[PDB]
Ligand binder design. Structure first.
Ligand SMILES: [Ca+2]
Ligand SMILES: [Ca+2]
Length: 298
DNA sequence: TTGTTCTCAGGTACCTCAGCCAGA
DNA sequence: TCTGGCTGAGGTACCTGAGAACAA
């Protein structure tokens, strides 16, 4: 049994709450004693361009594997002993997926019994149900019914959730009344299905600043005020693993706003910093760029 | 002339299942 | 009959922009 470092577990619990998945399944199976086979899996998905991150996990956790699916990759752990050992250690730090974790640990321990009785098996399948109910389940076929046949601790965890479900954005917004016809915009955002808004609300309390906004079926925590933002990113930046470049770039920009609102040179140079931030992001619908701002030649 | 609030939306990058096979 | 490595995809729940309007 490997013991995992607490700091590793804090960050990881956040990223897992963000991009991870804790899953239990009943596999239709003729060979199986009860025509069904239970699978338990922990997943971390990420764009293949960042599979190094998932490759790190394999090394740090020390078990599991990484697979590709064209554009997107996954870390996967289904081996039972190690899975229980890992989840046992991770669950105290989970906030969104903690109930799932614990249910998967219960199932794992009750296994030996489940396989030696039709009735014990059934009960266990009703835990798989529960887990699926907790997840954003949408394509599940085989169900049990079928079978009837401390500030550093918060910043480490918050870095994790931010590296996964969050976004550090910098924008150049076209505007007539602006001295150089464009307005700089910096934003820290965290996104979440509106049914977990209570979580983005918690952030407003813990961070001290910002607001939660709703739209369609999702909500955002957003932070755009130049001061608070600089304060926050200065604190949070040491603990980021995917978005550290973006965080610094935003701090470097904020520090050079003074001299940027003075000369068309500094302004256009700071615009290239915005370009770099979007390059680093998974940018897809960006319109106004620095080259655009180079119409300032007019 | 600037900062900020508040909502919307394109295009995925996730999540959460589905399943087959070889080995012991 | 059991376990773990490996593969495919449905349908969002995110990310990362956009811009109109309020408040200075
Ligand atoms: Ca998520
Ligand atoms: Ca992500």
């Amino acid at each position: 049994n490997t013991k995992y470092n607490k700091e590793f577990l804090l960050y990881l619990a956040g990223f897992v709450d963000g991009d991870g998945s804790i899953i239990a399944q009943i596999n239709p199976n003729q060979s199986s004693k009860f025509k069904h086979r239970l699978r338990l899996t922990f997943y971390v998905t990420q764009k293949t361009q960042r599979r190094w991150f998932l490759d790190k996990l394999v090394d740090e956790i020390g078990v599991g594997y990484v697979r590709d699916s064209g554009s997107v990759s996954q870390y996967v752990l289904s081996e039972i002993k190690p899975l229980h050992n890992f989840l046992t250690q991770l669950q105290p730090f989970l906030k969104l997926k903690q109930k799932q974790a614990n249910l998967v640990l219960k199932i794992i321990e009750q296994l030996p019994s489940a396989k030696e009785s039709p009735d014990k098996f059934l009960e266990v399948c009703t835990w798989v149900d529960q887990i699926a109910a907790l997840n954003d389940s949408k394509t599940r076929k085989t169900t049990s019914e079928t079978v009837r046949a401390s500030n550093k601790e918060f910043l480490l965890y918050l870095a994790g959730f931010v590296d996964s479900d969050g976004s550090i954005i910098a924008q150049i917004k076209p505007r007539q009344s602006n001295k150089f016809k464009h307005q700089l915009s910096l934003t820290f955002a965290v996104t979440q299905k509106t049914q977990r808004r209570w979580f983005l609300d918690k952030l407003v309390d813990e961070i001290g600043v910002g607001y939660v906004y709703d739209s369609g079926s999702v909500s955002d925590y957003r932070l755009s005020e130049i001061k608070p933002l600089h304060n926050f990113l200065t604190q949070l930046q040491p603990f980021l693993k995917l978005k550290q470049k973006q965080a610094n770039l935003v701090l470097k920009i904020i520090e050079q706003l003074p001299s940027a609102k003075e000369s068309p040179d500094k302004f256009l140079e700071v615009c290239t910093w915005v370009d770099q931030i979007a390059a680093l992001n998974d940018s897809k619908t960006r319109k106004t760029t620095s080259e655009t701002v180079r119409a300032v030649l007019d």
